[PDB]
């Protein structure tokens, strides 16, 4: 029977908006979902979203005959930067399907086998950094994972070396992007955007845009000028033709894809590796099991592609980390036509739904009562997981194109970490989840005692 949709508390003309006046809006939305259940309406001035949290409703929203990928408010905002790249394009935009067809071969098994050696290059730099620490020095986990994941996408994707392990501070490209996005957001909150007090902000913004454009120019120019032509993501961007049309990407779209992939390729994976290490050091029985697997499988000085595929329990650790804290914590959908969701909630054409992935992943009707515990064995039998219960990589044709890249990199790196070191949660770290568009365990630190096993 038709039901009235719960809605949290309203503040006059501001509606629900100031419930998100917090540095942890996703964690706030989870608490609302705890109070109101599987679906709730959330209104801001001029905007309406419905937040879904149950597998039963999310399964229906994932029916692509009824619902398509929506560009949420955050996606429409970052579209100013990522244009009609794969992430920030509508499914019905010609450049989506075209780039999808051209770039999908960059994530084939053959391509993955080709990325493996370059992933090992960066993973070795990570291990060697930690091997080289003096006594009593600790590791800043998310910081080092970010160094790794940035360098991995740069190298595997574009043959560009960020050399993040040679720097104290983040690469200027990252700093520029962060500061440009922060400025663009601050702009929207300024009562008087033409106040001369903001002149320096505007000048800084142009400089930051130029840092980003200079890197994209260099990545393209160095490839075109090189004697080596390689076979990577950039190769397909520059040369690949859409089989449906015979056309290659145009120059403008290529530039959007490059920055799209540089950003997509690193920060969500960095958080995954950080959360996985967090859970491991908090669950010493799981850590021992994972470490036993790493020692038994990784019998050569550097892992091979096939050995990474054999790290089954490491893979389950990573899925269980993505269950609890999926590092892209939502994706957005809209109703293609008028329709009724769950036989209970009528929707008009165009209505937006937000999939609240952390809350999906805590649906007790699917996972049982222990949803807050870290138990990788939940994934021991993959056929037992109902479809649409586990969605850290989105849905359908708009699912993450890089999912296998991310997981292969993370499995490789976590395996090598577990082979080469014993880890200590020397501060008894208290989980504090810092939110941007992603999630990270802020201030997570550990010590790594080397097992003195040499690399190749
Ligand atoms: C743990 C790591 C990752 C997570 C959690 C993640 C998550 C997601 C999710 C949820 C989407 C769907 C977005 C939406 O529906 O609006 C998505 C799309 C995408 N991801 Fe990822 N991602 C990860 C890693 C990567 C990596 C390593 C790359 C690139 C090498 C990548 C590139 C993309 C692209 C290009 C899309 C857009 C696909 C399309 O619609 O054509 N992601 N990702
Ligand atoms: Cl937001 C964004 C912009 C450009 C590329 C990728 C992504 C996205 C993401 C999410 C959180 C923090 C940084 C990037 C993302 C966009 C929309 C919905 C989910 C994730 N992403 C990273 C990996 N795959 C997709």
Residue numbers in the entry: 1 to 456
From the manuscript:
Among the bacterial P450s, one of the best characterized enzymes is the Bacillus megaterium CYP102A1 (P450 BM3), which Armand Fulco’s group identified as a fatty acid hydroxylase that could catalyze the hydroxylation of saturated fatty acid substrates, primarily at the ω-1, ω-2, and ω-3 positions. P450 BM3 (BM3) is a natural fusion of a cytochrome P450 (N-terminal) to a FAD-, FMN- and NADP(H)-binding cytochrome P450 reductase (CPR). More recent work in our group has used the double mutant (DM) form of the flavocytochrome P450 BM3 enzyme (F87V/A82F), in which the first mutation expands available substrate binding space in the active site, while the second mutation is more distant from the heme but causes a structural readjustment in the P450 that alters its conformational state. We also report the first structures of the BM3 DM heme domain in complex with four different azole drugs, confirming the greater plasticity of this variant and its ability to structurally adapt to bind to several azole drug compounds.
The crystal structures of the BM3 DM heme domain were solved in their complexes with the azoles clotrimazole, voriconazole, fluconazole and tioconazole. In so doing, the azoles ligate to the ferric heme iron of the WT heme domain through nitrogen atoms. This occurs through imidazole nitrogens for clotrimazole/tioconazole, and through a triazole nitrogen for fluconazole. For all the azole-bound structures reported in this study, the hetero-aromatic nitrogen ligand is oriented so as to fit within the groove of the I-helix formed between Ala264 and Glu267/Thr268. The voriconazole, clotrimazole and tioconazole structures contain multiple monomers in the asymmetric unit, and in each case the general protein conformation corresponds to the “open”, substrate-free conformation of the enzyme, with little significant difference in protein or ligand conformation between monomers. With the exception of the heme-ligand interaction, most contacts established with the protein are of a hydrophobic nature. In the case of clotrimazole, one of the most hydrophobic ligands, two additional 2-methyl-2,4-pentanediol (MPD) molecules derived from the mother liquor were observed to interact both with the ligand and the protein. As binding titrations and EPR studies were conducted without MPD or similar compounds, MPD is clearly not needed for azole binding. However, X-ray crystallographic analysis revealed single occupancy of the azole ligands for each of the structures solved.
